[PDB]
Design a protein around this ligand. Structure first.
Ligand SMILES: Cc1cn([C@H]2C[C@H](O)[C@@H](COP(=O)(O)O)O2)c(=O)[nH]c1=O
Ligand SMILES: Cc1cn([C@H]2C[C@H](O)[C@@H](COP(=O)(O)O)O2)c(=O)[nH]c1=O
Ligand SMILES: [Mg+2]
Ligand SMILES: [Mg+2]
Ligand SMILES: [Mg+2]
Ligand SMILES: [Mg+2]
Lengths: 194, 194
């Protein structure tokens, strides 16, 4: 009976794109890179591998490194918005996030990051999964255009969170965006309430 | 269109009760303990705290310790059964597990344990969450009697996996058990298929 909202972590709460670019340039100063304006498509590794041989593996090495996830900066407005959202009557918020294959640091640091920005009690709201379609809710706010998995008819409406890699994408109606946390997220939530 | 089954980790795949008792007795040999036959109720910490002052905190210290989760032994038949189950046509298996509050080791070691017993490709099937009711499926096989959360009407049927702490519990019809992995799990799955 409470509206349930899944909020994606990387590219929505945490600035994966910015953190990755900064750390890639610092580690690999002699390699070419993709400026954020020129990012296209969800997969960083795939765009970097097209740029040249061996860059896909070098990109992956950034996010496999210790401290990568933990040191991501929150996207503007994200912490404030999600705190407000969670505090709303008849509204339950979960943070829904996919870990990488290499599991040494990523799960741990994601829990640490949520504690850092939202406090210990918000840890109970984390769902770590590679398949978001088996998580049920009214809304999923997520920067990845193509969200698929084991469930062919997910219960949520996917609202596309704007990111550098998707900002030029024309969606099929009635697919809808949340343009940033400065955009009117309350209106989107209210549109799904009884 | 594929039957989806959530399989709980602790108390179903991994022998939490046995591992905990062994490590508690080794660390705290001068303290009283609860033999598995005498376990009642999901919460170990709560039964130990009733046994005496300070034992709840000493129990918690076992599973907060490094290597606790990783070193759990699989329950008899569990690895074999889940491998077979996953390989069945029109059947998708996810491992659905709740982490502790202290996140330094538990998420990491749970991923490590799944890799160890099921292989790298099975990592994609893990769902870490404190709330199982927001995970949608046809079945949930889980040793905890009371499974509640944000979703008042979960999409799964909860089948109670027998454990020392629940073996004496009379369930309200039509609630049903899977008595061990030697019991006929295929019959339970088939009962939910079209
Ligand atoms: C951009 C990118 C992210 N990832 C991982 C990083 C995060 O663990 C996961 C985040 O996905 P999500 O934002 O859909 O939850 O995707 C890759 O493995 N390769 C990539 O190219
Ligand atoms: C028995 C017990 C388990 N736990 C934790 C251990 C596991 O992380 C989690 C397993 O729960 P689950 O088997 O329902 O997924 O419960 C406690 O925090 N206190 C306890 O007394
Ligand atoms: Mg994302
Ligand atoms: Mg609320
Ligand atoms: Mg369990
Ligand atoms: Mg299968």
């Amino acid at each position: 009976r409470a509206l349930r909202v899944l909020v994606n972590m990387d590219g929505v709460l945490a600035d994966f794109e910015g953190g990755f670019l900064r750390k890639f340039r610092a580690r690999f100063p002699d390699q070419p890179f993709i400026a954020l304006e020129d990012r296209r498509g969800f997969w960083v590794s795939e765009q970097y591998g097209r740029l040249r041989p061996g860059l896909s593996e070098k990109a992956i090495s950034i996010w496999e490194s210790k401290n990568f996830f933990f040191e991501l900066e929150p996207l503007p407005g994200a912490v404030e918005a999600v705190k407000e959202m969670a505090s709303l009557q008849n509204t339950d918020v979960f943070i829904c996030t996919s870990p990488i294959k290499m599991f040494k640091y990523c799960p741990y640091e994601k829990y640490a990051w949520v504690e850092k920005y939202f406090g210990p009690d918000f840890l109970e709201q984390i769902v770590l999964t590679r398949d978001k379609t088996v998580v049920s809710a009214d809304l999923l706010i997520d920067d990845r255009p193509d969200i698929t998995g084991a469930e062919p008819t997910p219960s949520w409406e996917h609202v596309l969170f704007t990111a550098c890699h998707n900002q030029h994408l024309q969606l099929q109606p009635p697919r809808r965006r949340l343009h940033s946390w400065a955009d009117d997220w309350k209106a989107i939530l209210d549109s799904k309430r009884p």
